[PDB]
Design a protein around this ligand. Structure first.
Ligand SMILES: [Mg+2]
Ligand SMILES: [Mg+2]
Ligand SMILES: [Mg+2]
Lengths: 120, 138, 121, 139
């Protein structure tokens, strides 16, 4: 494609986790996480919305899953698509050797257009 | 647990011609099926297989042990496959089958699998309920 | 079209380097939070990305970018599967709040030497 | 300051034919140039211009006032341009010119520029000392 990539960090805060975050980061409701949200562009076209959580306390392997979600109002807006549009989402969790999770990243793609292609 | 919505022989669409390396008059077996987990639909799946590969087989061996039947008896062995993954909204038809609302997020997987000599033997197109599924990457 | 994936290589609070001081407008005692990732596409390294935020920072636009070219250090040659000394594109981005206060400095460095960008005017 | 290292008319090479959209036998002006900041060389540029657009200008105009001169005179407007940015190691030659070492990191920009009417007028290939330069993306 050859385009110049860029990003905007949309939020960066410390917070108590969601259920998903509890599940994937093996945490309790009281355990703080540090959370980054970032739009990535390829030449000023938005390409994905990316949310990364690490457990605050932290101030191996990793594994990914793919799914489809609906465009929320806010994400629709960041990615310049419409609420309701179907969107690929990639969840990644990384772990230290103990199997202690340390990062949970969730990427959503601007469309509804994007495809991934795999070979076995 | 799975349910077979349909199972006929038919002439291919152009997609089917194209992914199966077939001319317009070669027949396909076309098979449609829903699969359930805890009695909730997980995925709807249309498979087309060139009929010439499969016309001498038993409906249940096509249906439950396709790959093993082909290895077993075709005298060819299974080679590469490719998958194309995308997100799409549920049509009413799919929302019907999968028991969700029209417009709900579908994870769509399209796949073509070849024999080791390069012969396409199936084109399978699967629609998963987004909220109920996760595709685990190797 | 290839499935992307990343590996955080380090993540720590630290006292800033000279360019961090310069781009984030900090002094040597000011701490930053510094993350370093390798981004892959189908398990081919694509870029190495370092990003640094003022640690104190726990209303945006604008930001601006710069390109240049750097030699692959040994650390980086390894991370991106290329040779020490190869010439690689490096992009720098600093993002600011409306007031002008810099709040993030990211440096992306590309695998090869082979990579190109294309602009139009 | 800037220094013209060479300056002469040539029949175009293949890449020059292709980018400037010229047949073999259409002359081009080919000029090579080093620019300095604070007496340290920042960059080396090769520029090729169709000779027919430029026959009538004099060297100074071409070397220092190219864009100005072109628009003041040619009865054409400077239209689109495009650029391809890559990273390359310094050759022995470019090292000598830029006063750096073989191997050192070069930011390379190749550019074609066009008139508002679609005609190429410039194929410019610039090699910047990585460590001494930054290219600013247009806001
Ligand atoms: Mg089809
Ligand atoms: Mg730096
Ligand atoms: Mg050339």
């Amino acid at each position: 494609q050859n385009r110049v990539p860029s990003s905007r960090t949309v939020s960066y805060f410390v917070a108590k986790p969601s259920s998903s975050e509890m599940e994937k980061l093996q945490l309790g409701p009281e355990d703080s996480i540090l959370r980054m949200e970032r739009i990535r562009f390829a030449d000023d076209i938005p390409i994905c919305f990316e949310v990364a959580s690490i457990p605050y306390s932290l101030v191996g392997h990793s594994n990914q899953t793919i799914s489809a979600v609906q465009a929320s109002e806010q994400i629709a807006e960041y990615l310049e698509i419409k609420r309701g549009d179907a969107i690929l989402r990639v969840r990644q969790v990384s772990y230290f050797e103990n199997g202690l999770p340390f990062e949970y990243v969730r990427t959503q793609y601007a469309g509804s257009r994007f495809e991934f292609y795999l070979e076995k």
